[PDB]
Amino acid sequence: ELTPDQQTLLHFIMDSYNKQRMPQEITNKILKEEFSAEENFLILTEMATNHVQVLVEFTKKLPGFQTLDHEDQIALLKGSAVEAMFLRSAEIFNKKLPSGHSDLLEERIRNSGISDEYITPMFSFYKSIGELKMTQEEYALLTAIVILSPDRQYIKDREAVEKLQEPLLDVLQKLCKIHQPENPQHFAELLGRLTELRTFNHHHAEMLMSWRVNDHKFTPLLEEIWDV
């Protein structure tokens, strides 16, 4: 049994989460454009920039986020972005997409100048997330939880952030005992994946280092959320 407040919170979040769209201007490129590495990298750069917009729109609308210290709000976006991005792509790769999209998107990522060192962990993480057979509820809440991690670099008031995080952890723990009745592990299995998810903070840093020594260029929004 969820409380009446925890039912108000979860509606506030799945409303927030289901506005997350990738425009067709961009999805149509998966199938339409030529297959070359320059073109693949560019398709991903658009995809990234548009999603980073959508992520700041989601984060903005989290309960209590607006109340937070201004320098901390930034530390939260910058610390959480890589994780929130890889979690999203994991939802996308375990979801029914239009015909051919799953397959060709994969092929594009696989020929976009990303070393095999990092392609591998990427797709075995998507497999791993696939097996928890998650719901939109759980994607939304995990994403929300990841964003409001209080233990990122730079954060000045941890307690403030804890206070917004803990409510969401509560709702997710109670949802794991409801919709997965015969397994008390589901919730600690989820939190277990966040460890694997946290490795992409290194993989993605290398992905960029490598991209940059080959004179590739990113949008000014991506440059901001991903710098120093």
Binding site: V56, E57, K60, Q73, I74, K78, P220, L221, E224, I225
Partner: peptide, 12 residues
């Protein structure tokens, strides 16, 4: 100077 992030946060 993360102007774009500041901008996206304060908006509507």
């Amino acid at each position: 100077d993360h102007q774009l992030l500041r901008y996206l946060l304060d908006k509507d």
